[PDB]
Short mmCIF file of C-alpha atoms and ligand atoms in Angstrom, two decimals:
data_model
loop_
_atom_site.label_atom_id
_atom_site.label_comp_id
_atom_site.label_asym_id
_atom_site.label_seq_id
_atom_site.Cartn_x
_atom_site.Cartn_y
_atom_site.Cartn_z
CA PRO A 1 0.15 -0.20 -0.25
CA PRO A 2 1.10 3.47 -0.60
CA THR A 3 1.83 5.54 1.84
CA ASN A 4 0.47 9.05 2.41
CA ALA A 5 3.90 10.66 1.50
CA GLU A 6 4.12 8.48 -1.50
CA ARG A 7 0.58 9.56 -2.27
CA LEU A 8 1.53 13.42 -2.27
CA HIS A 9 4.24 12.36 -4.72
CA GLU A 10 1.50 10.68 -7.24
CA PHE A 11 -0.49 14.42 -6.80
CA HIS A 12 1.75 16.78 -7.36
CA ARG A 13 2.81 14.55 -11.01
CA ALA A 14 -0.46 14.59 -11.89
CA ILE A 15 -1.11 18.35 -11.46
CA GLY A 16 2.29 19.17 -12.78
CA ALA A 17 3.79 20.51 -9.78
CA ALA A 18 7.26 20.65 -8.73
CA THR A 19 8.21 17.25 -6.76
CA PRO A 20 12.02 16.47 -6.95
CA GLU A 21 13.45 12.95 -5.63
CA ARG A 22 16.03 14.55 -3.46
CA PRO A 23 16.36 17.62 -0.89
CA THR A 24 16.47 20.65 -3.35
CA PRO A 25 16.58 24.49 -2.11
CA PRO A 26 13.56 26.05 -3.33
CA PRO A 27 12.27 29.53 -5.14
CA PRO A 28 10.80 31.76 -2.45
CA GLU A 29 7.68 31.14 -4.72
CA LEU A 30 7.48 27.56 -3.45
CA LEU A 31 7.63 28.74 -0.05
CA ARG A 32 5.19 31.67 0.32
CA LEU A 33 2.92 29.13 -1.56
CA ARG A 34 3.57 26.22 1.21
CA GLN A 35 2.73 28.98 3.42
CA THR A 36 -0.17 29.97 2.04
CA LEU A 37 -1.70 26.43 1.92
CA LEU A 38 -0.73 25.64 5.52
CA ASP A 39 -2.55 29.18 7.05
CA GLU A 40 -5.48 27.81 4.94
CA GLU A 41 -5.83 24.46 6.07
CA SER A 42 -4.75 25.20 9.62
CA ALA A 43 -7.29 27.56 9.85
CA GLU A 44 -10.18 25.05 8.90
CA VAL A 45 -9.21 23.00 11.30
CA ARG A 46 -9.36 25.77 14.12
CA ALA A 47 -12.78 26.24 12.94
CA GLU A 48 -14.44 22.84 12.98
CA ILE A 49 -12.75 22.49 16.51
CA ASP A 50 -14.18 25.70 17.20
CA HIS A 51 -17.85 24.55 16.01
CA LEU A 52 -17.35 21.44 18.58
CA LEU A 53 -16.57 23.16 21.36
CA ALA A 54 -19.59 25.60 20.61
CA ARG A 55 -22.09 23.06 20.56
CA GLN A 56 -20.75 20.66 23.24
CA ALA A 57 -21.08 23.99 25.35
CA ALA A 58 -24.58 24.38 24.60
CA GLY A 59 -25.23 20.55 25.59
CA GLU A 60 -25.21 18.98 22.36
CA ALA A 61 -24.21 15.29 22.64
CA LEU A 62 -21.80 14.84 19.88
CA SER A 63 -21.58 11.71 17.61
CA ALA A 64 -19.22 9.85 15.61
CA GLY A 65 -20.72 11.42 12.29
CA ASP A 66 -20.74 14.75 13.80
CA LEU A 67 -16.49 14.24 13.93
CA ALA A 68 -16.16 14.06 10.17
CA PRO A 69 -15.68 18.09 9.62
CA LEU A 70 -12.80 18.18 11.88
CA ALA A 71 -11.13 14.96 10.24
CA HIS A 72 -11.76 15.88 6.91
CA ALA A 73 -9.88 19.19 7.47
CA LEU A 74 -7.18 17.85 9.90
CA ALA A 75 -6.45 15.48 6.79
CA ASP A 76 -6.34 18.35 4.55
CA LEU A 77 -3.60 19.75 6.52
CA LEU A 78 -2.09 16.62 6.78
CA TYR A 79 -2.06 16.70 2.82
CA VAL A 80 -0.36 20.19 2.79
CA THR A 81 2.11 19.37 5.34
CA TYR A 82 3.34 16.29 3.68
CA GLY A 83 3.09 18.40 0.43
CA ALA A 84 5.31 20.90 1.45
CA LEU A 85 8.13 18.37 2.24
CA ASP A 86 7.55 16.45 -0.95
CA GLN A 87 8.23 19.86 -2.94
CA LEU A 88 11.24 20.04 -1.03
CA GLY A 89 12.29 16.67 -2.59
CA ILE A 90 12.61 15.78 1.12
CA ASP A 91 11.00 12.03 1.87
CA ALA A 92 8.59 12.75 4.80
CA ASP A 93 8.53 9.02 6.22
CA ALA A 94 12.65 9.06 6.39
CA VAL A 95 11.94 12.40 8.31
CA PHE A 96 8.92 11.00 10.24
CA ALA A 97 10.41 8.41 11.33
CA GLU A 98 13.32 9.74 12.70
CA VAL A 99 11.21 12.14 14.58
CA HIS A 100 9.15 9.45 15.92
CA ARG A 101 12.31 7.24 16.74
CA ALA A 102 13.41 10.28 19.53
CA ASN A 103 9.61 10.71 20.83
CA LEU A 104 9.47 6.70 20.89
CA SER A 105 12.64 6.75 23.63
CA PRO A 125 17.24 13.65 20.05
CA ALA A 126 16.18 13.89 15.98
CA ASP A 127 18.63 14.59 14.04
CA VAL A 128 16.94 15.43 10.84
CA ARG A 129 20.07 17.53 9.33
CA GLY A 130 21.60 14.02 9.05
CA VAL A 131 18.26 12.70 7.67
CA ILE A 132 18.55 15.48 4.85
CA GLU A 133 22.06 14.95 4.48
CA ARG A 134 21.54 11.08 3.77
CA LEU A 135 18.72 11.42 1.28
CA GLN A 136 20.76 13.73 -1.22
CA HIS A 137 22.57 10.18 -1.72
CA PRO B 1 5.78 -1.45 7.25
CA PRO B 2 4.15 0.98 10.01
CA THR B 3 2.45 3.99 8.77
CA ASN B 4 2.88 7.30 10.39
CA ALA B 5 -0.57 7.02 11.70
CA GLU B 6 0.24 3.61 13.55
CA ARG B 7 3.59 5.03 14.52
CA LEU B 8 1.21 7.85 16.91
CA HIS B 9 -1.00 4.73 17.98
CA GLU B 10 2.21 3.25 19.08
CA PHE B 11 3.52 6.19 20.80
CA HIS B 12 0.38 6.82 23.12
CA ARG B 13 0.36 3.08 24.00
CA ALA B 14 3.76 3.76 25.28
CA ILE B 15 2.78 7.01 27.12
CA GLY B 16 -0.63 5.99 28.95
CA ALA B 17 -2.74 7.85 26.49
CA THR B 19 -6.87 5.84 22.28
CA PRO B 20 -9.69 4.86 21.06
CA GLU B 21 -10.18 1.44 18.08
CA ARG B 22 -13.61 3.65 16.35
CA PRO B 23 -14.46 7.38 16.07
CA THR B 24 -15.16 9.03 19.72
CA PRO B 25 -16.27 12.34 20.54
CA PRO B 26 -13.48 13.86 22.83
CA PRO B 27 -13.88 15.68 25.87
CA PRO B 28 -13.56 19.29 25.24
CA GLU B 29 -10.52 19.68 27.34
CA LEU B 30 -9.24 17.38 24.83
CA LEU B 31 -10.33 19.58 21.96
CA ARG B 32 -8.51 22.50 23.24
CA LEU B 33 -5.55 20.84 24.02
CA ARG B 34 -5.02 19.27 20.23
CA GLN B 35 -5.97 22.81 19.13
CA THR B 36 -2.70 24.15 21.12
CA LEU B 37 -0.84 21.79 20.07
CA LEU B 38 -1.42 22.69 16.45
CA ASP B 39 -1.23 25.85 17.06
CA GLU B 40 2.38 25.80 18.59
CA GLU B 41 3.89 23.53 15.60
CA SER B 42 2.35 25.32 13.28
CA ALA B 43 3.78 28.68 14.47
CA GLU B 44 7.28 27.00 14.13
CA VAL B 45 6.61 26.16 10.63
CA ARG B 46 5.35 29.53 9.72
CA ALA B 47 8.35 31.04 11.28
CA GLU B 48 10.81 29.24 9.83
CA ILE B 49 9.72 29.71 6.18
CA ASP B 50 9.09 33.22 7.23
CA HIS B 51 13.07 32.96 8.21
CA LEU B 52 13.94 31.19 5.09
CA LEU B 53 12.06 33.73 3.00
CA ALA B 54 13.78 36.62 4.83
CA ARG B 55 17.30 34.98 4.05
CA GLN B 56 16.44 34.70 0.19
CA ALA B 57 15.13 38.15 0.23
CA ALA B 58 18.68 39.16 1.40
CA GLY B 59 20.43 37.39 -1.49
CA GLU B 60 21.19 34.15 0.30
CA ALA B 61 21.33 30.83 -2.03
CA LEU B 62 19.58 28.41 0.36
CA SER B 63 21.40 25.12 0.28
CA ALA B 64 19.57 21.38 1.26
CA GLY B 65 21.25 21.38 4.84
CA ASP B 66 19.50 24.71 5.82
CA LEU B 67 16.18 23.18 4.47
CA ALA B 68 16.81 20.50 8.17
CA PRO B 69 14.64 23.03 10.31
CA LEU B 70 11.75 23.23 8.16
CA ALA B 71 11.92 19.29 7.85
CA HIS B 72 12.19 19.20 11.50
CA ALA B 73 9.30 21.66 11.84
CA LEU B 74 6.54 20.09 9.18
CA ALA B 75 7.01 16.34 10.93
CA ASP B 76 6.28 17.95 14.16
CA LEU B 77 3.44 19.36 12.69
CA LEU B 78 2.38 15.79 11.08
CA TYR B 79 3.46 14.28 14.35
CA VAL B 80 0.43 16.32 16.27
CA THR B 81 -1.77 16.32 13.80
CA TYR B 82 -1.56 12.55 13.79
CA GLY B 83 -1.92 12.56 16.99
CA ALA B 84 -5.26 14.30 17.09
CA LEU B 85 -6.78 11.87 14.74
CA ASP B 86 -5.69 8.96 16.57
CA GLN B 87 -7.11 10.23 19.95
CA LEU B 88 -10.20 10.65 18.62
CA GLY B 89 -10.41 7.34 17.34
CA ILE B 90 -10.34 7.89 13.85
CA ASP B 91 -8.06 6.24 11.00
CA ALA B 92 -5.91 9.05 9.81
CA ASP B 93 -5.06 6.78 6.51
CA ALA B 94 -8.89 5.58 5.73
CA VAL B 95 -9.52 9.23 5.47
CA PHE B 96 -6.50 10.58 3.77
CA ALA B 97 -7.22 7.76 1.51
CA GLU B 98 -10.30 9.20 0.49
CA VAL B 99 -9.29 12.88 0.40
CA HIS B 100 -6.66 11.96 -1.79
CA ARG B 101 -8.58 10.28 -4.44
CA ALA B 102 -10.98 13.45 -4.47
CA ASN B 103 -7.53 15.92 -4.81
CA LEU B 104 -7.08 13.34 -7.57
CA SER B 105 -9.19 14.13 -9.47
CA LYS B 106 -8.86 17.87 -9.71
CA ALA B 107 -6.27 17.66 -12.32
CA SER B 108 -7.65 18.92 -14.89
CA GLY B 109 -8.53 22.53 -12.68
CA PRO B 110 -7.21 25.73 -13.36
CA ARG B 111 -4.44 27.18 -11.29
CA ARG B 112 -3.99 29.99 -8.88
CA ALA B 113 -1.44 32.40 -9.63
CA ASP B 114 0.36 31.39 -6.70
CA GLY B 115 0.04 27.74 -8.00
CA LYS B 116 -2.87 26.22 -6.10
CA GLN B 117 -4.77 23.67 -7.54
CA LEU B 118 -8.41 24.58 -7.84
CA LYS B 119 -11.26 22.47 -8.50
CA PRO B 120 -12.68 21.62 -12.40
CA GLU B 121 -16.19 22.12 -13.17
CA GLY B 122 -18.49 19.33 -12.11
CA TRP B 123 -15.95 18.24 -9.31
CA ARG B 124 -17.26 16.66 -6.22
CA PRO B 125 -15.42 16.27 -2.56
CA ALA B 126 -14.31 13.48 -0.70
CA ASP B 127 -17.13 11.54 1.86
CA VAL B 128 -15.03 11.81 4.83
CA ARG B 129 -18.64 11.37 6.49
CA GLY B 130 -18.75 8.05 4.69
CA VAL B 131 -15.55 6.71 6.09
CA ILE B 132 -16.55 8.00 9.98
CA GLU B 133 -19.75 5.59 9.68
CA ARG B 134 -17.35 2.69 7.72
CA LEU B 135 -14.94 3.14 10.66
CA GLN B 136 -18.11 3.76 12.99
CA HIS B 137 -19.82 0.39 11.92
CA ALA B 138 -16.76 -2.23 11.85
O1 UMP C 201 -2.27 23.19 -5.08
C1 UMP C 201 -2.93 22.43 -4.09
C2 UMP C 201 -4.42 22.44 -4.23
C3 UMP C 201 -5.04 21.50 -3.08
N1 UMP C 201 -4.14 20.55 -2.17
C4 UMP C 201 -5.08 19.94 -1.31
C5 UMP C 201 -4.90 20.10 0.06
C6 UMP C 201 -6.64 19.54 0.61
O2 UMP C 201 -6.21 17.85 0.83
C7 UMP C 201 -7.34 20.08 -0.29
C8 UMP C 201 -7.45 21.59 -0.27
O3 UMP C 201 -8.20 22.10 -1.42
P1 UMP C 201 -9.27 23.18 -1.49
O4 UMP C 201 -10.23 22.48 -0.71
O5 UMP C 201 -8.79 24.50 -0.25
O6 UMP C 201 -9.38 24.06 -2.58
O7 UMP C 201 -6.35 20.07 -1.73
C9 UMP C 201 -3.22 20.63 -2.42
O8 UMP C 201 -2.78 19.87 -1.72
N2 UMP C 201 -2.07 20.99 -3.58
#
C-alpha cells in the first residue's frame, strides 16, 4: 500500500507540480505557496474545533458522524504538510521516522536530509 | 511496515494515552489538540518566514538549510496525526479518501500562486462515509 507521503508524490506529478527526488533548495514562490496552504488548512481545523466546542458548550451530545468535518480538515492539513515536504524533495516518511524514534524513546533531521541527498 | 498513523498509535500506547473507533472527545482534549496544533504551526510559519528573509537578502539556500523546516513540518504531522488518533479516527482511511478527490482535480485551473483549483463538476471526498465505515466495523 502507498504511504500518504508517496500519495503526495502521485498528486504533484498529476497536477504538474514540482516534486524533486532529493532535497532541493526551493524558490521563494514555492515557500510562499506552502505557507499559504498551511495557513488555509490550519484555519479550517481551528474553525471546526471551534464549532465542536460551541455545540458541546450548549449541551449537544456529539456523535461520531459529527467529527467528520474536523477529520476532513485534519486530513487536509496532513495533505499540505506532506505536500510541503514533497515539494522540497524531502522524503517525509524518512523524516517522520527519525522524529518518531526520538519521541518514542534527539531527532537528527539534518542527518536525514544529508542521507537523502545520496 | 507501519504507517505514520500507526506510529502515533504506538506512541500513545507507550505514554499511557486511545480509542479504536471514532469517539467524540471531551472539550478539554479538543482545546489541548488545538494548542498543540497552534504551537507546531507557528514554528513552521516562522521557519518559512525565516528562509524567505534570507533569500530576500540574496542568500542562495542549501539543502542542509532545509533541516529546521523539515523538522518543524514533521512535528506538525506528529501532532496532527496525534489529533486524529486521540479521536479514534483512522487517519489513513480518511487520507485515502481525501487523496482520491484531490487526484480528481488534475484538470482544474491553477491559482496565480500555484494552488490547484477544482474543475467544473468536481465532487468532494465523502469523509462522513469514511467515519461511518470506521464507526461500524
Ligand atoms: O495546490 C494544491 C491545491 C489543493 N491541495 C489539497 C490540500 C487539501 O487536501 C485540499 C484543499 O483544497 P481546497 O478545498 O482548499 O481547494 O487539496 C494541495 O495539496 N495542493
